[PDB]
């Protein structure tokens, strides 16, 4: 049994949730139909770390039809579906992740996804975050010498690169999935703008119509937090460091206000920044009774839950707390802080991770069959392949393709097959 | 007198909504503020085709203001204010401008801007859609000889720089401003969300609830066009022909369509394409009697008007017109198919014109102050102006930047004072 998840039962559940899936994800079932044959992927090992759903689920077993090795894990303790990793266990697919790890377990299963049986190594990473990248740069750099690549799903994670680009740290070819017009400007905005919603509900039943709302954070995902408050009729209000973020935050009809003067008038909290201590001690001090903090950038950094621990916690139900302050205050705290869309709900849902995860496979064929013209650097997909995505997915949703006539072609200075738009167009 | 507009009389007219403007566009008068003493632009003698507006009055003396000489001109026969005209020639700047120029009229006016009172070349060329740019490289090549660049205001005289670039003929340097993303993301946007609505009201009256409504494009023209429709309960339909455009019209709930399915079913066509005879005889031969047709893309080019010449024209109002098929079935044509909102009302208003036009007055600094640097080449300005000029605009709307902290700098890898985002943000 070269699987750990936390109970195995639920794969019939698991299975039936991932053949509706497969309808939603049309995406991952062209690559299948593509690229089912020839298996570009044959003599791939891909380490995967990426929130264990069933989404997941999907991607995983299209990298598989396509020849692949893998073995994986969640990037977050509390984001796995437990129905999702068992259904892949029962596939014979080595998975260590379930909804609940310690940390201590989180950095395990992310060790047992760089070794299998019969001295298995991985020559692919696939990485949501940077962890799994940072685990293989600083802790097995033995490694490193048979990896390909890594293909790094996230905002967050594809600043890490950065950094360590810049030290040169990184020492391996690095494709940003995240940055394909087709992840970042779906995945992070139009999930965000369903998933959110859906963490809140689950874990509080708070109504949104007629709240204040503040929304740290107006890129991908703090703009689909905000769409998202605004349609069930929230006040929302945005923070920003960035003055063109904020100026279009401003411009949609946002009030632009920082946390240092509003944490006494909001009832929800909502953080997208992708940094450090944004929601501080005195902050959540001057928070009103039963405010909801919930954060949804990756890391739990974004909230300073270290100065909360003075304090009582009551636990309401799994991935929801109160924090007692001594004035008998309580603000309501879900998943501790980490990423609230996963881990008091089920994340994005399967359509738009279709999007992320065929940018996913097409940089796997990538990295696996062409690493060699590859730098230590960071690199993203062509726009034809990106423009391919989204044509995969034109179907599913009944959006029908106008054709230009070679004059209208030649009118704007495009290809008729695309690609259409400069490198720089920013959509 | 170097000056040729309709009616002078209307300068005090054009003068008291120029000093109301003022308030309006904070970047232009914060530019005023800080080089109004240096004045980085004396010796700077600037031919301008832009529509000849109010805002482009407070633009035009902004550069005055800095040190310039200038010569303008609109870049369409129906955009110019005539009494922004009138205040700009009162105050003894030459402009050749009037609402309802002919073809021939047109170019005159253009050729106004390339020689004044002795022997009065120009060293700058500030372009919106290329007309100014291809006269001087095809008819003046010995003008092109003392000018240090031009600066192109949008996408479709954009494309015309590449095209000239990649078949050699581009023979100085260009500054793309329509894709600072304080131009691209703001200006065809958030003002085509507003004007769109203003030119067809001014238009027709036209009830826009209920009315299914097509969008050819999808765009950032395209993307405020529809936002602007769907806002006021119009069904709004998308054409593409870019994937990912159209991907993202469908998940805004947009239908997306094409018009050879249905040119029928319309009751109001938007044509925001940039390209050339998406509106066909065919398709306006199928329209519905009454059917409002109007084109938002920067040239007529987009309805093919030819097609019609052999109908009979009835007249409305100016810019309103019918044609009348042999059925007797009548089409309501804006503008003769030239720019609507600037033809059939005032253009984006002087707010989200003051970000575009603080992006050209930059662009002219730079241009004239080091331009030996650049090659016969298109650039974009850097990432730190594009901020600087959101942030001489967040006042006016009372939006509260939140400052970095050190380590909150460090945790994403930028400085406290900006850039913010990587080179290829897409925002
Ligand atoms: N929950 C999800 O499903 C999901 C999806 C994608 C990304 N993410 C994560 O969310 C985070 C943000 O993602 P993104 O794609 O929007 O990145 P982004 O860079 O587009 O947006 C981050 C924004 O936060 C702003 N910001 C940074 N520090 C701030 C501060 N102290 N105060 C106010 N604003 C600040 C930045 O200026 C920026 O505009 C990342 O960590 C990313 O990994 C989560
Ligand atoms: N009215 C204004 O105030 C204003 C402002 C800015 C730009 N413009 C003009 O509007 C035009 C479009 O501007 P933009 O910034 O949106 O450019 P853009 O390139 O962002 O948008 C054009 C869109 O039209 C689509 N398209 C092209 N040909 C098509 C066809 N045959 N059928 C369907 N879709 C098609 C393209 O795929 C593209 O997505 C340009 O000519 C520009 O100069 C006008």
Redesign the pocket.
Known sequence: QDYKVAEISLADWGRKEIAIAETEMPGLMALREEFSAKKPLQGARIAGCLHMAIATAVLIETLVALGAEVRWSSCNIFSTQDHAASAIAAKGIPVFAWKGETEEEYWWCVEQTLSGPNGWTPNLLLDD?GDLTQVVHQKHPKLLTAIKGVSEE????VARLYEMAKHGQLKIPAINV?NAVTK?KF??LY??RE?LLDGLKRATDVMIAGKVALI????????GCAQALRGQGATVLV????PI?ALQAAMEGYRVVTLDDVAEQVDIVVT????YH?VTHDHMKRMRNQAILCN????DSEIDIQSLKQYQWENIKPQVDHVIFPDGKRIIILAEGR????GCAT??PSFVMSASFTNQVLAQIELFQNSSQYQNQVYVLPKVLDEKVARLHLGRIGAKLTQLSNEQADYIGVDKNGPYKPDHYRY
Not at 239 to 242: F, H, K, P, Q
């Open positions: 975050g996230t905002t967050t994670g995240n970042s995945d992070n999930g965000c998933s740290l954070g107006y890129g991908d995902v703090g703009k923070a920003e460091i960035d973020c997208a920044t992708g940094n944004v949804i950038g990756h890391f990423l609230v869309n996963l994340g994005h």
